[PDB]
Amino acid sequence: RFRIFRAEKTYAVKAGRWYFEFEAVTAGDMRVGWSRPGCQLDLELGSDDRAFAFDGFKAQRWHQGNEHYGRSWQAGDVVGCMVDMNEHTMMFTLNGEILLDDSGSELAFKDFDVGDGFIPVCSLGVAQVGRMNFGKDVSTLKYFTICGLQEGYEPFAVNTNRDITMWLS
Ligand SMILES: [K+]
């Protein structure tokens, strides 16, 4: 079966600009993007409203269906995943280069509802190897300084270092 990896749902982002990387170690059937929290992702990623995904196998963008977008990865390529939760846009880079849809737009997805926010997600097909890097050690990100850093995006790990919550009785 397919393996779905997702950030812990308690770390979903509802504002700000966020970045993570996905290394396609193999070059086959994998998808990577942003998932709504607490939803069940038993379907193919982004076939419904539960996620927004880049399919680097077939060069498609997936949200409530598919359209051509970007280009396919080669083994060892790194996808950068960016979400601006205030402008309601998502962008992807492949080895630092911004991917475009057929209209020439860099907005992979736009005008989406914030809802309960988003967490990084990826799906790996049979025998596929793909690694999400949230950048806890920012120096392990490969393309953040090329595209992401100057644009004001924060590594997703910045939102996951806190492990304590507080409330008033
Ligand atoms: K943590």
Curated annotation (Swiss-Prot):
It is found in: Sarcoplasmic reticulum membrane. It comes from the Eukaryota. Disruption phenotype: Embryonically lethal. Embryos die at about 10 dpc, due to defects in heart tube development. Cardiac myotubes display enlarged rough endoplasmic reticulum and cytoplasmic vesicles that contain high levels of Ca(2+). Channel activity is modulated by phosphorylation. Phosphorylation is increased in failing heart, leading to calcium leaks and increased cytoplasmic Ca(2+) levels. Highly expressed in heart, lung, cerebellum and brain. Detected at lower levels in adrenal gland, stomach, thymus, esophagus and ovary. Residues 1-139 form the B30.2/SPRY domain. The calcium release channel activity resides in the C-terminal region while the remaining part of the protein resides in the cytoplasm. Homotetramer. Can also form heterotetramers with RYR1 and RYR3. Interacts with CALM and S100A1; these interactions regulate channel activity. Identified in a complex composed of RYR2, FKBP1B, PKA catalytic subunit, PRKAR2A, AKAP6, and the protein phosphatases PP2A and PP1. Interacts directly with FKBP1B, PKA, PP1 and PP2A. Interacts with FKBP1A and FKBP1B; these interactions may stabilize the channel in its closed state and prevent Ca(2+) leaks. Interacts with SELENON. Identified in a complex, composed of FSD2, CMYA5 and RYR2. Cytosolic calcium-activated calcium channel that mediates the release of Ca(2+) from the sarcoplasmic reticulum into the cytosol and thereby plays a key role in triggering cardiac muscle contraction. Aberrant channel activation can lead to cardiac arrhythmia. In cardiac myocytes, calcium release is triggered by increased Ca(2+) cytosolic levels due to activation of the L-type calcium channel CACNA1C. The calcium channel activity is modulated by formation of heterotetramers with RYR3. Required for cellular calcium ion homeostasis. Required for embryonic heart development. Belongs to the ryanodine receptor (TC 1.A.3.1) family. RYR2 subfamily. This is Ryanodine receptor 2. It comes from Mus musculus. The chain holds residues 1084 to 1252 of 4966 of the full protein.
